[PDB]
Every structure is written in structure tokens, then in C-alpha cells.
């Protein structure tokens, strides 16, 4: 299924993901499409910061959900 990742510079990255993909996996897919290392990635959805070690279904990210990508300053 496809989820959208909106960045702060205004890009919208579309990822092909599965409900069982973990946040760590999603960040790896963003690293694959955009080059940003996972430790620079801070993912927000439905008022929540997404934790590595939960899946997309843990936060109920369904088809065509829109995540927000911001900087994780610890990695930057």
C-alpha cells in the first residue's frame, strides 16, 4: 500500500509499505528514496511521534495516510 511522507521543504515522498512494516523499516525506505539517514528522521502522524519498534498498524496508518518528516536534531 502507499503512504505519503510530507517534508518540511515541501516534498511529498510516496512509499510502498505494508501494515506490518515497522517505523524503522519506513525510515529505511525513506533513506532509500531520499538519502536521509534514519537517525536524522523524526516521523509524525495523528499527533504522535512515531517510535522505532512499532509498526504502521500500531499507529493505524492506513492506505494513503500522510506522515510528516521533520529533523531529529540528535542526528543532526
Amino acid at each position: 500500500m502507499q503512504i505519503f511522507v510530507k517534508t518540511l521543504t515541501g516534498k511529498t515522498i510516496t512509499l510502498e509499505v505494508e501494515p506490518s512494516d515497522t517505523i524503522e523499516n519506513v525510515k529505511a525506505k525513506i533513506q532509500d528514496k531520499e538519502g536521509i539517514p534514519p537517525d536524522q528522521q523524526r516521523l509524525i502522524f495523528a499527533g504522535k511521534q512515531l517510535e522505532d519498534g512499532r509498526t504502521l498498524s500500531d499507529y493505524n496508518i492506513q492506505k494513503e495516510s500522510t506522515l510528516h518528516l521533520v529533523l531529529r536534531l540528535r542526528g543532526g
Binding site: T7, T9, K11, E34, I36, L71, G75, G76
Partner: protein, 148 residues
């Protein structure tokens, strides 16, 4: 205050040996409030640009660092579009032994040599690392539109 006496010593230092393509000084009647200009380094995408910075010396200077931000838009991995500057000596590696001259020279070094592995703008950092020609042509365009 010991901050004021300190700021005068550093301004006098800058008047002794001014660092090339770097000037700075108080904006007006406020000695804690400075403005700086960085001339874009030649053999950088910023060549020909003049980049303005605001500098503020907090009341506890030099035990806290000066606050420094670009007011000229600049395309850089460690400088966001607000002019906020990610540079270690402005935060965790500040030392009362450092001067505003060394701070300015560090920002000039950042322009010619960014730290893309610890960026403030991850997208620009990736462009700089993986497509330097694109980084250069964007930074030149931004220099032309905003710093000239």
C-alpha cells in the same frame, strides 16, 4: 558589566587585525547588538554575495555564547531558511576563550566546508553530499537572488 568590557576588547581586536572578507560591529547605540557581513568566499557557490548576520551578546557573555543568525537567505546544509545556524561553537562547544572573530571565521569555514553529516536541513545535506553540482547551482542561484 563584565560583558560590556569584554565586547569592547573584542571589537578593538577586530579593529587591530580585521579578518579578510568579514566585518562586524554594533548596529547603533546598543553595544550588545552587532551586525556582521560575510562576503561569499570566492571558489564557493556564494561568491559575489554579501551575507548579513545579526549578533547578540547575552547579558551573561562570555559564559553563554553570542546568538548569531543569518538575515540574508542562504542555501546551506547547516543554515535553515530562517538563518538559524547549526554550528558547535554557538552551542555545546562554546568557550569563554572564543572570540567573535573566531565565531565569524568558523561561519566562513562552514560556508566553504559544510557539515552535511550533522545537518540542520537534511534535504540540502543530501544534495550537497550526493550531487555537489546541483548543490552549487542552487546555492549560486540563491546567492544571486538574495545576497546580491
Amino acid at each position: 558589566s563584565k560583558a560590556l568590557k569584554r565586547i569592547h576588547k573584542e571589537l578593538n581586536d577586530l579593529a587591530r587585525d580585521p579578518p579578510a572578507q568579514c566585518s562586524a560591529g554594533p548596529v547603533g547605540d546598543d553595544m550588545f547588538h552587532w551586525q556582521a557581513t560575510i562576503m561569499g568566499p570566492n571558489d564557493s557557490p556564494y561568491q559575489g554575495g554579501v551575507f548579513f548576520l545579526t549578533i547578540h551578546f547575552p547579558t551573561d557573555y562570555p559564559f553563554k555564547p553570542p546568538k548569531v543568525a543569518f538575515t540574508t537567505r542562504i542555501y546551506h546544509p547547516n543554515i535553515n531558511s530562517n538563518g538559524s545556524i547549526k554550528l558547535d561553537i554557538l552551542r555545546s562547544q562554546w568557550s569563554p576563550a572564543l572570540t567573535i572573530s573566531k565565531v565569524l571565521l568558523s561561519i566562513c569555514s562552514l560556508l566553504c566546508d559544510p557539515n552535511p553529516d550533522d545537518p540542520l536541513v537534511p534535504e540540502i545535506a543530501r544534495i550537497y553530499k550526493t550531487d555537489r553540482e546541483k548543490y552549487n547551482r542552487i546555492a549560486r542561484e540563491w546567492t544571486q537572488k538574495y545576497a546580491m
